[PDB]
Design a protein around this nucleic acid. Structure first.
Ligand SMILES: [Mg+2]
Ligand SMILES: [Mg+2]
Ligand SMILES: [Mg+2]
Ligand SMILES: [Mg+2]
Ligand SMILES: [Mg+2]
Length: 756
DNA sequence: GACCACGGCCACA
DNA sequence: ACTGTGGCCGTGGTC
């Protein structure tokens, strides 16, 4: 199983290292033959001699062009004659590429910025994380001595915890009498001890939670001060720091540092992403938090260090469990993209399609288009039309079915051969024409994008079959991961075609896809109402809810089964309207806000406040209860009882203040805010007391009793003292709870007055 | 100083 | 930095 790749230098020449795990043991393959290269497009091939003599400067050494090969690749499906420029070392390309672009006779250079070791995974057609090879893992967290107004890592590391299959344990340089605590003297002896434990266990994966930004950085600083060789690398190297936009990530050569924080950021949507919050969300059991002030006071008085030892042990223990939950799927995603788990677990879904496409393009000798320059980025701000959204037949409904298209946009791309290399291609013998936008798409040959999407969705269906037949339990959920990941990857290809900074940007393709989706959807909505007598209640991009007025459920079910047969014969190619589900009732508020109820009894909520992070828990709780009271029982008078009870509780300040917290993210530099809402009024006051407020910070505030601007009297919930503060009951009654339940109960003639 | 457009956040498909 | 479509509110600007 390939685990990562990099390269070292030997007498100037680069050497690819493939970090594998084969037949139970770690091993390193070395390749001294792979040469670095990029392509160049010339006016006349004669100029190759002027450019083969281009020169530049790096490391006090002159970078020159090794050799040049003339090759034929495709660019936009067209036969193009390009010049392959080889170099001796990867670091030659930055030093000389910009000087090459500016030569008179070069139209453009391509694929000039692909990391050498990632280039290798592609050019050699190798796949990380392939095989049944099981990986030995190890989580670790640290405790620190924090004082306000101190430099980062001014204080020592107090505890180092680690967990795996064998259990959780804490090293610490003070006596705590707990069976899982290993005591040493000095923190230098705990760090060397941790190195001893990691080196002995030789784990394939080191799982942290924000170890990209705290744990490894703190360990580094301490190791510099105490003169410790912090050689976690399987080659004996120290952790390597890379830039991650305005952040950092840490490599451990020969291993996979799997930081769970970015992974869980994208995979789960939570109000706050503390280790304790994420653990409760994922496993249903709560995790207790002890704070830095608690930890420092415990360490310097020597008292109650055992609860700090328990916190550190749990940090590692729960970090191992989340590692086991989130790693296998991310290892399947690594397999799909053809990039290392370290990279993929730190990449956006938008970044990954480029890597997948890059690999496919190389498979098909297709010259990857360059990333856009800033002038083209401005030509790419033209907008287009998206999905059709119907104003819901606002109110409550009976016996409704949801019909949705199977992968509407991929079906469209495949069926009509939508690709930048098929758009308005001249001299074809068969075309399809997009509605409204009128873009013609050649069909003589399958295009780049439709070929991959077909291979992808074909593979996904193969996977799902072998899965349902698989006789191994792990391989089952592995295959389950692969096909689930293929579905997400398929429907990010449309988003790519419209993305500002996408290599295969094609606005004409992107708007042709949405145009076809709107035609097909509004057509089926027309046919189901006219031919079959339904009424479409609400329709977003690729589906709709509908029923037959004053009709049975069995009548709605069977007749809808009929309409599916009728409409799927009318639908061309891979388009397919399917029967997603039946629901006994459903309330529809506005566009993007509804909630339906199974005949088994499960409620599904969409877009309403119940699903919103930035709404108080008391409002979401109470609205939920009002939904159940209606969808489950039609008890319009139980719903009003709920609201009157809740408002009475708030007015008596009887509601737990924990339910009144509002979570809003910071998205930019506070310098750059033009409008200051309450959460950025809190933030600006926090930074004024020296708190790091970066993009991503989840402000969590409460509104205290008073008058005037909400922001002027909102405080962080970190600082709510029920003996020194009264929350603003009037705000949470009148500006949170009532407005949320009222949008629903207005359909039955209830004003906010009727809800007390 | 009542009325409102709207930065700004997050949801949906 | 995957897309477009959309609801909602605290805030300050407006005649
Ligand atoms: Mg790497
Ligand atoms: Mg930490
Ligand atoms: Mg058509
Ligand atoms: Mg955009
Ligand atoms: Mg829909």
């Amino acid at each position: 199983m390939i685990l990562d790749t990099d390269y070292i230098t030997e007498d100037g020449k680069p050497v690819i290292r493939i970090f594998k795990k084969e037949n139970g043991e770690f091993k390193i393959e070395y390749d001294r033959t792979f040469e670095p290269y990029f392509y160049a497009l010339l006016k006349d091939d004669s100029a190759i001699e002027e450019v083969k003599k281009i020169t530049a400067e790096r490391h006090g050494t002159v970078v020159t062009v090794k050799r040049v090969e003339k090759v034929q690749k495709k660019f936009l499906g067209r036969p193009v004659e390009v010049w392959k420029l080889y170099f001796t070392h990867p670091q030659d390309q930055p030093a000389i590429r910009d000087k090459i672009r500016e030569h008179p006779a070069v139209i453009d250079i391509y694929e000039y910025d692909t990391p050498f070791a990632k280039r290798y995974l592609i050019d050699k057609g190798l796949v990380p994380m392939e095989g049944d090879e099981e990986l030995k893992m190890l989580a670790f967290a640290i405790a620190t001595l924090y004082h306000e107004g101190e430099e980062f890592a001014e204080g020592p590391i107090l505890m180092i915890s680690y967990a795996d299959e064998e259990g959780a344990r804490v090293i610490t340089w003070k006596n705590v009498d707990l069976p899982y605590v290993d005591v040493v003297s000095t923190e230098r002896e705990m760090i060397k001890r941790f190195l001893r434990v990691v080196k002995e266990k030789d784990p394939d994966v080191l799982i942290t939670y924000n170890g990209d930004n705290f744990d490894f950085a703190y360990l580094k600083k301490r190791c510099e001060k105490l003169g410790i060789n912090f050689a976690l690398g399987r080659d004996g190297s120290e952790p390597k720091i890379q830039r991650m936009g305005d952040r950092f990530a840490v490599e451990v050569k020969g291993r996979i540092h799997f930081d769970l924080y970015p992974v869980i950021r994208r995979t789960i949507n939570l109000p706050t992403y503390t280790l304790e919050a994420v653990y409760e969300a994922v496993f249903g059991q709560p995790k207790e938090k002890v704070y830095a002030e608690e930890i420092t006071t415990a360490w310097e008085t020597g008292e109650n260090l055992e609860r700090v030892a328990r916190y550190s042990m749990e940090d590692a223990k729960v970090t191992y469990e989340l590692g086991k939950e989130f790693l296998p799927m991310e290892a399947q995603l690594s397999r799909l993209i053809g990039q290392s788990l370290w990279d993929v677990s730190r990449s956006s879904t938008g970044n990954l399609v480029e890597w997948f496409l890059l690999r496919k393009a190389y498979e098909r000798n297709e010259l990857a288009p360059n990333k856009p320059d800033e002038k083209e980025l401005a030509r790419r701000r033209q907008k287009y039309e998206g999905g059709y959204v119907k104003e819901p037949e606002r109110g409550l409904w009976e016996n409704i079915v949801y019909l949705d298209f199977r992968s509407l946009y991929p079906s469209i791309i495949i069926t009509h051969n939508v690709s930048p290399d098929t758009l308005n291609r001249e001299g074809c013998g068969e075309y399809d024409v997009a509605p409204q936008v009128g873009h013609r798409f050649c069909k003589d040959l399958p295009g780049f994008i439709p070929s991959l999407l077909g291979d992808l969705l074909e593979e996904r269906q193969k996977i799902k079959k072998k899965m349902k037949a698989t006789i191994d339990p792990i391989e089952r959920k592995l295959l389950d991961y692969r096909q689930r990941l293929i579905k997400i990857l398929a429907n990010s290809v449309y988003g790519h075609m419209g993305f500002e900074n996408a290599r295969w940007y094609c606005k004409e393709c992107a708007e042709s896809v949405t145009a076809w989706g709107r035609e097909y959807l509004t057509m089926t909505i027309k046919e189901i109402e006219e031919k079959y007598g339904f009424k479409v209640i609400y329709s977003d991009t690729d589906g709709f809810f509908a029923t037959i007025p004053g009709a049975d459920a069995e009548t709605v079910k069977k007749k809808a089964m009929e309409f599916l047969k009728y409409i799927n014969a009318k639908l061309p190619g891979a388009l397919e309207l399917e029967y997603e589900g039946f629901y006994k009732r459903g309330f529809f508020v506005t566009k993007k806000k509804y909630a339906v109820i199974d005949e088994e009894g499960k409620i599904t909520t969409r877009g309403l406040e119940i699903v919103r992070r930035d709404w108080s828990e008391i409002a979401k709780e109470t609205q939920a209860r009002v939904l159940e009271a209606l969808l489950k029982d039609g008890d319009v008078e139980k719903a009003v009882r709920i609201v009157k009870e809740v408002t009475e509780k708030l007015s008596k300040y009887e509601v737990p203040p924990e339910k009144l917290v509002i979570h809003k993210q910071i998205t930019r530099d506070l310098k750059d805010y033009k409008a200051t809402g309450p959460h950025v009024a809190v933030a600006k006051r926090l930074a004024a007391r020296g708190v790091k407020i970066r993009p991503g910070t989840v402000i969590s505030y409460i509104v205290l009793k008073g008058s005037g601007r909400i922001g002027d009297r909102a405080i962080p919930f970190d600082e709510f003292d029920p003996t020194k503060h009264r929350y603003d009951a009037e705000y949470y009654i009148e500006k949170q709870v009532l407005p949320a339940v009222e949008r629903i109960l207005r359909a039955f003639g209830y004003r906010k007055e009727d809800l007390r």
